[PDB]
């Protein structure tokens, strides 16, 4: 399938003679691979995947150095934002950034991303064409005007099209199969008697990876996406994930109902009925 | 590898 790299950056300002906390997290194929936190003992970029040991100290020098600069950038930006929004000293404020790469399975660039959020709301984003900006708020306009003035998009476009892609290419061969992992789900349904002639059928999927998955309940080929319950997919803590989905039906007629589970690492969907 | 932002916001 396709591949991706992202860096998720955050700066959080809190009231004081304090400095904002700057946190930067790297991801290759959605899996955290490097990380830098400004509240660290010894502020630096640490590996988070074993295959990143391969990189020598020179890499870590550059990247953490690169981090300290971003840290400044966020600090200044954070102050400007306070102006732009007419917010008065003593606030808790947050500034976020996602940027990176998508590759198809030909390792050919598919799309670059660059977007910012203030207070957890879209603030400005590079458009797919990688030369125009979308700005949400009125306050974002002045950034846009300014960045259109300085031709910022050309700076990012160079990065998104060049380095981001190459380094991802580099990480991909060092990560290799490691991040090709799938663990398929295991599924069962638990049978829960209700009042009123009912039973709650709960369809479980456990120990799967990646997190993406879909579970559905079917009455007679028809798909009851209709008043079933889901939970947000959850981490087990061990690298795998879990989810469940329930329907309420008349017990005795449990063969009528069927759960299906869809996941990359399945040769094909799982079909399962409650087993007496 | 991380990017270097250009002009501030």
């Amino acid at each position: 399938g396709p591949h991706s790299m992202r860096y998720f950056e955050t700066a959080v300002s809190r009231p004081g003679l304090e400095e904002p906390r700057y946190i930067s997290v790297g991801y290759v194929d959605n899996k955290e691979f490097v990380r830098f936190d400004s509240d660290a003992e010894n502020p630096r970029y640490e590996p988070r995947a074993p295959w990143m040991e391969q990189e020598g100290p020179e890499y870590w020098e550059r990247e953490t150095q690169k981090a300290k600069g971003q840290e400044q950038w966020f600090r200044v930006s954070l102050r400007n934002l306070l102006g732009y929004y007419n917010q008065s000293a003593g606030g808790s404020h947050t500034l976020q950034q996602m940027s990176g790469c998508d590759l198809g399975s030909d390792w050919r660039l598919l799309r670059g991303y660059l977007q910012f959020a203030y207070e957890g709301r879209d603030y400005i984003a590079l458009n797919e064409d990688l030369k125009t900006w979308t700005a949400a708020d009125m306050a974002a306009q002045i950034t846009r005007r300014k960045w259109e003035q300085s031709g910022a998009a050309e700076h990012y476009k160079a990065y998104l099209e060049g380095e981001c892609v190459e380094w991802l290419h580099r990480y991909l061969k060092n990560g290799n199969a490691t991040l090709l992992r799938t663990d398929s789900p295991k599924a069962h349904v638990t049978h829960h008697p209700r009042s009123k002639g009912e039973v709650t059928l709960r369809c479980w999927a456990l120990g799967f990876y990646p997190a993406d998955i879909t579970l559905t309940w079917q009455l007679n080929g028809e798909e009851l996406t209709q008043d079933m319950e889901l939970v947000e997919t959850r981490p087990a803590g061990d690298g795998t994930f879990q989810k469940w989905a329930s329907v309420v039906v008349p017990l005795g007629k449990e063969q009528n109902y069927t759960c299906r589970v869809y996941h990359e690492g399945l040769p094909e969907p799982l079909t399962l009925r409650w087993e007496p | 590898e991380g990017s270097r932002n250009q002009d501030w916001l």
């Binding site: 998720f8 955050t10 959080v12 809190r14 946190i23 997290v25 955290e32 990380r35 936190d37 808790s92 947050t94 976020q96 996602m98 959020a117 207070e119 957890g120 709301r121 879209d122 638990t190 829960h192 709960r202 456990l206 939970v231 947000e232 959850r234 981490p235 087990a236 803590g237 061990d238 879990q242 | -």
Partner: protein, 99 residues
């Protein structure tokens, strides 16, 4: 607007009274990222609680996994308690071995 955390409480492995396990408290979709989470045994703060690092989602939202070692029993109750700017009162969610 700040965003109200969603909380789930559940064990790593299928629960079995008497069998050591891991209890998770997963809290998601909140902002701002400052948050205070406690895991409770029978109303009392559990010491030594693993807490993952600050992370956010493609929709800019923050989330955290908290987890601790534990042994489910028939009479011990377990809970996650969260304080966050978006909520007047702290919220408590009780482990439910079926959920």
């Amino acid at each position: 607007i700040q965003k109200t955390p969603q909380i789930q409480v559940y064990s790593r492995h299928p629960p079995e009274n008497g069998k050591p396990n891991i209890l998770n408290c997963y809290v998601t979709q909140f902002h701002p990222p400052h948050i205070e989470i406690q895991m409770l045994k029978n109303g009392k703060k559990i010491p030594k609680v693993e807490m993952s690092d600050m992370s956010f989602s493609k929709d800019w939202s923050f989330y955290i996994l908290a987890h601790t070692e534990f042994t489910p029993t028939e009479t011990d109750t377990y809970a996650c308690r969260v304080k966050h700017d978006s909520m007047a009162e702290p919220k408590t969610v009780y482990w439910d071995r079926d959920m």
